[PDB]
From a paper:
Repulsive guidance molecules (RGMs) are cell surface proteins that control processes ranging from brain development to iron metabolism. RGMs can bind to the cell guidance receptor Neogenin (NEO1) and act as coreceptors for the bone morphogenetic proteins (BMPs). Structural analysis of RGMs and their complexes with NEO1 and BMP2 revealed a common RGM architecture comprising an N-terminal domain (RGMND) essential for BMP binding and a C-terminal domain (RGMCD) sufficient for NEO1 binding. Here, we determined high-resolution structures of all three human RGMs in complex with the BMP ligand growth differentiation factor 5 (GDF5) and the ternary complex of GDF5 with RGM and NEO1.
We also determined the structures of the RGMAND–GDF5 and RGMCND–GDF5 complexes. A relative rotation around this leucine permits the side-chain of the preceding arginine (Arg100 in RGMB) to be inserted between GDF5 fingers 1 and 2 in the RGMA– and RGMB–GDF5 complexes. GDF5 interacted similarly with RGMCND (Kd 3.9 μM) and weaker with RGMAND (Kd 16.7 μM). Our structures reveal specific regions on RGMND (RGMA Leu97, RGMC Leu101) that could be blocked to inhibit the BMP/GDF pathway but preserve NEO1 signaling.
Author numbering:
A (entry chain A), B (entry chain A): 397 to 501
C (entry chain B), D (entry chain B): 47 to 60, 74 to 116
Write the structure that this text describes.
Amino acid sequence: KARCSRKALHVNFKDMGWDDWIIAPLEYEAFHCEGLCEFPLRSHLEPTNHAVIQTLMNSMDPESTPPTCCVPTRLSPISILFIDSANNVVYKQYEDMVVESCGCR
Amino acid sequence: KARCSRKALHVNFKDMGWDDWIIAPLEYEAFHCEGLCEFPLRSHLEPTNHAVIQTLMNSMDPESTPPTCCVPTRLSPISILFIDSANNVVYKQYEDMVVESCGCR
Amino acid sequence: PCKILKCNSEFWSAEFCAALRSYALCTRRTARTCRGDLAYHSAVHGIEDLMSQHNCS
Amino acid sequence: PCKILKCNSEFWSAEFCAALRSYALCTRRTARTCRGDLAYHSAVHGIEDLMSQHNCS
């Protein structure tokens, strides 16, 4: 029952059978978001106007408005090396791979 | 127990005591997001790589990975007319006010 | 200019209403600068709501 | 080019495993074009997981 915060989430590609196409890396830290989004919202959550309004309304009457959710609001990329369709090795920067801040939306 | 979808959410500024500073409008349709984010994810959800990976991991082992959440992924603005600090009437376009699509994040 | 996000990190991080009145004072210390920020009016109305919920005289 | 999001809207919108094999065929009909999309490999591995969950011979 703690605030919306970032937590460890380890991603292992070998566990997902993606060893058949991913070269490197084989695992990375991705994190995940988890926590309560109740009124009021913290500065580091830096949410959307809609998020503010929905939170305030959920605080006023939880029966008529459900609370917002704890989700990633800033992400960073990682670069993966793989073999695509044409049997070509590709170094690609995949976006939105590492959660860097959580917030309420 | 339905998919992550957009639902009606009516915002009434008079109910929030913001009648003391907002001129017009006095109410608008804002919508909200609600629904399950389980594997697999639909095309219209158009989610982040991290969202895909977290959903897949939650599907593999729900004890080690919690599911993503249903939140607004596209919003539209509305224009509000109000009286600020200096007793000046201001027509401002506030962003992220109307949910226009939901997704999993 | 506006600094209500500090009261959002001061009251939110801290049986009687000796603390809710402290939040009301934190918000009223900037009762002019934040005329426009949605979070300011939201916090004022939320303090009003919590004032008539736990019976604060 | 890639079109796994239709199988993500066909199987996901539809006691036996006569339908999970249909999803496997939907994904294998494009077993080359989507070599790179995270959702393609995710759907393949998820079909593999659901294949060894409801006992499909």
